[PDB]
């Protein structure tokens, strides 16, 4: 049974990256002792505490549900009652780091290529009823030069069954950047929310992650960078409610522009479908073709 990964056969290489309550190991699976086995991405637990055991679980069996070109594969989990989720191992690591590397190298054409996988896997995942509520560059992984892949879901949401959000009562992490308005405010994530976040990935990939203009450098600058921890989100939330928006990055086309700041409307039903985004992206490429 080769989704049963023995712990004592993973051998650690090195490590790929960790926030708040996990961590992602590059490991060779190697039960031949020889060096030989599979090379393999881990993901576990840092504190691995009832509460967190428990989401996730919730985690991996999301992700084993999701099959799709742009989303990283499922492997299998090793039980030592502590888990960890086996996955492939993406080797160009992630696009954050990636673009930031090679940064203009990457033209126009290919960024779009990446924004076109980046929107499919969405579209797909939210037909799971599944709200990632992280979707920025540096969840976002390299498979090669004509493949990315969204590569983390710790995150990630399933709606109820009755409702088209999910309301997070005691949030944790929260990138508050890349939030929508009414996520900020009332801790509501949608597909809707999403979409929002996609428009600021399209701001990233289009300013060739410049540090000096990240999505928290600009906003910082917008509120004043005198404003401090939960002042932070009050004044971003005063903002975005008066239409203050990220800037065009430079030598962004036109109609790249417009789709970051349609996701970014205040008006939940006024943003567009992944769906919608994905036909379009790939219309634009075809013209630039
Ligand atoms: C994206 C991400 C989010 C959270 C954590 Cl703990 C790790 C990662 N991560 C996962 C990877 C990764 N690299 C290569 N293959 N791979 C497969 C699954 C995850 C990965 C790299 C990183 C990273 N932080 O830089």
């Given at each position: ?23 992602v190991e590059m490991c060779r699976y190697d039960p031949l002792q020889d060096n030989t086995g599979e090379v393999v991405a881990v993901k576990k637990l840092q504190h691995s505490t009832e509460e967190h055991l428990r989401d996730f679980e919730r985690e991996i069996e999301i992700l084993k549900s999701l099959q799709h070109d742009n989303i990283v594969k499922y492997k299998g989990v090793c039980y030592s009652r502590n888990l960890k ?205």
């Amino acid at each position: 049974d080769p989704t049963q990964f023995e712990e004592r056969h993973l051998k650690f290489l090195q490590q790929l990256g960790k926030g708040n309550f996990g961590s992602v190991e590059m490991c060779r699976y190697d039960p031949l002792q020889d060096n030989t086995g599979e090379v393999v991405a881990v993901k576990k637990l840092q504190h691995s505490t009832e509460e967190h055991l428990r989401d996730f679980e919730r985690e991996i069996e999301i992700l084993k549900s999701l099959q799709h070109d742009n989303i990283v594969k499922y492997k299998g989990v090793c039980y030592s009652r502590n888990l960890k989720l086996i996955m492939e191992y993406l080797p160009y690591g992630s696009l954050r780091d990636y673009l930031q590397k090679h940064k203009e190298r990457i033209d126009h054409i290919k960024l779009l290529q990446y924004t076109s996988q980046i929107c499919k896997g969405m579209e797909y995942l939210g037909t799971k009823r599944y709200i990632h509520r992280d979707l920025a560059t540096r969840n976002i992984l390299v498979e090669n030069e004509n493949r990315v892949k969204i590569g983390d879901f710790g995150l990630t949401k399933v709606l109820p069954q009755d409702k088209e959000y999910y309301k997070v009562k005691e949030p944790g992490e929260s990138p508050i950047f890349w939030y929508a308005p009414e996520s900020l405010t009332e801790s509501k994530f949608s597909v809707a929310s999403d979409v929002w976040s996609f428009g600021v990935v399209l701001y990233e990939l289009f300013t060739y992650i410049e540090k000096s203009k990240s999505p928290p450098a600009e906003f910082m600058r917008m509120i004043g960078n005198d404003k401090q921890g939960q002042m932070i989100v009050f004044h971003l939330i005063e903002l975005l409610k008066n239409n203050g928006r990220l800037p065009r990055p430079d030598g962004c086309p036109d109609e790249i522009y417009m789709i970051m700041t349609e996701c970014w409307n205040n008006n939940v039903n006024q943003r567009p479908s992944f769906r919608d985004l994905a036909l379009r992206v790939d219309q634009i490429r075809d013209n630039m073709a």
